[PDB]
Write a protein that binds this ligand. Sequence first.
Ligand SMILES: Cc1ncc(COP(=O)(O)O)c(C=O)c1O
Ligand SMILES: Cc1ncc(COP(=O)(O)O)c(C=O)c1O
Lengths: 382, 382
Amino acid sequence: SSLRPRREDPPVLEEWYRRHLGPDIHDISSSGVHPYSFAEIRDVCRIPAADLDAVVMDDSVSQGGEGVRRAIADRYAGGDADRVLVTHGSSEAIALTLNALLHRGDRVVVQEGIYHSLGHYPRAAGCDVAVLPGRAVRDGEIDPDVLAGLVTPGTAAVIVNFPHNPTGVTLSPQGLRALKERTAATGAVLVWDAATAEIAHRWEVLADPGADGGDTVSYGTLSKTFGLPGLRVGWAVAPKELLTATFPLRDRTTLFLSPLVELVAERAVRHADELIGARAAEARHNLAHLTGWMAAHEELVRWTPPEGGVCALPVFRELERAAAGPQEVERFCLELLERHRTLLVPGTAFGAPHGARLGFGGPQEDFRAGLDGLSRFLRERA
Amino acid sequence: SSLRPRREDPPVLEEWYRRHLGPDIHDISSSGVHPYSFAEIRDVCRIPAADLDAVVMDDSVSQGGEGVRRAIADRYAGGDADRVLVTHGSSEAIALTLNALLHRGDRVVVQEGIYHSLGHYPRAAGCDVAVLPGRAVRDGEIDPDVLAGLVTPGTAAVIVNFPHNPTGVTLSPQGLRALKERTAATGAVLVWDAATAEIAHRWEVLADPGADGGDTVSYGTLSKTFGLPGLRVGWAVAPKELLTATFPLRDRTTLFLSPLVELVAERAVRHADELIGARAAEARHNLAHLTGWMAAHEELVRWTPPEGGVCALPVFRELERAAAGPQEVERFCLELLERHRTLLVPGTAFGAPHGARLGFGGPQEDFRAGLDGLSRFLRERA
Ligand SMILES: Cc1ncc(COP(=O)(O)O)c(C=O)c1O
Ligand SMILES: Cc1ncc(COP(=O)(O)O)c(C=O)c1O
């Protein structure tokens, strides 16, 4: 038999979860807020059984159904439904638009430790990639001296995720304005993954640069702040010409979304403030508790507190002292899971060999139990 | 600004529908049976509102949820849920498995006029493609003399769709057995798109070669025979080793399906006979009527009757006589739509310059109206 499957290494993040997600664990590893049940969604978003029952299970359309596009456009595109592309999670919006955007040889600037798929597409397109160092982002701005050297005339795209999964670093409105001015000046396309945009702790929620109506591409999803990762709805906001250029790829991958899913997503987006607000309050409750926990453990752990989003990257001092290598953090996390039923994501998934992602957007009761597990574990090793 | 979207030609099929689908037309162009409403699905598939309400909108898993995988495996994989991959339509299953299966330089045999995405992936992978001529498939078998020259030791894959969209040609159980014997002998992977497998008119429904438990890849979908194109659920049946090799690609495109969608799909597959049977009876009603219509129009139209599925490819004699070129059939279909509100798909979408796809799986009332439109149109031109 000639069957010889092409093999590629899976991203560390997703493989970690395939191997270790399961029942009876304290999962304090997520970059999202814990999921709603469909009952809660129907309640909050005002979805009578009859409205679902009326949906004819027919084809939807290439760009996304008009109702859901409009709801998203009103919140993130200044009401221009023509600049919205509705997709199976933001994962699909990323795959579609970056395949259409990026060219072999293009100079592209990519945020250090960016979400795996955002780093994958420029590499795979054969772009000339320069990294934006994580240390250059501080106090709500990218160091203007760093931005000046990295983004210059001929720079094709600048690709960032703010608030950043997993560190929670983000920009202030002033920082975003300065970033947009540099990309506009050079003609670079700003590519802005706003997965956790709706939850901001230090400065205000960043207005979607997609709403400006220029040559920027931004992503959003219901997966991380809305409690709907299982709905599989995200979007890109971008010029119509880029969006339609994605259709041939969409034609041989997914075709279109379900009108039943699109109805639900439309109602969720219309009720975004209630869905997000309830989960954001719980996350901030957990965050206040996590901050106290971190102060109590400052000998064993250090961190930058998150400026946005619902996860952070604690760094374990014992891994800094012993100094690497990357495999040690994976062992650390495995042992923690084995001995204490507590799940983090090892920093190898994000280019941070000495850290792990700790999510605080899960349920408040389970959060304490996970922290107790981590506490016992750190004590045992010290 | 550097924004320069990469441009590719869209498949003719999907672009035709983007330009010409709409309200107030008689659509007799589809390769599928007309969609159920969600109300009907809940009724037939026994889905209480409470079962939907219980679904937590959390992550599903890379291979597809266990319940839906099992339901599909029982019907098409001889009960081996490990050999099933559940995907966003069969479109995604095709994209995922062919990306993992096909290698540059591989000799691949591809059915003439095959569904666009099935023809795209071997071309794009840089396979060495030989075409299986449509005229070689007759009376339920591929001409053994043709199969002998095309599929030889070192042939990597043979890619076919039976029943065939748009001609409705298919194989008998004997024809399928002979095809499988030739691929098994040479070590070629049979890739078997069974989108319309459940509706067979001349011989029995073909048992899924996926159920054999060898090195074959077969696709199915809820889109064409179940009345659920808008659910966006399909699958591949294939060796587990090929399926898991798709995970890295799935990790940067769709991640996984919705558990809410997976619940519905599981119940639909369990109630497949009722969902399919009702629509199959209506299609056969339309087919009996279409056959009489074709006899009444034998001066202007010829056809091979469909052996399976719910569409056929009538050939318009006036286009044969005047002899091409391909653009004339598109004009023909446009005029038909403009003047008579009746939609076909021009044969340019399927490599058949003188034909158009005529679907008989739509509602019986709308079917007559479409045929009257086509009749008036053919008379006008004669
Ligand atoms: C920053 C970022 N972008 C995009 C995604 C893709 O998620 P989805 O496809 O559920 O929208 C994720 C999820 O991990 C993420 O953390
Ligand atoms: C033969 C064949 N295979 C696959 C597909 C993909 O459909 P879906 O993604 O809805 O399963 C189609 C739909 O046009 C088809 O006709």
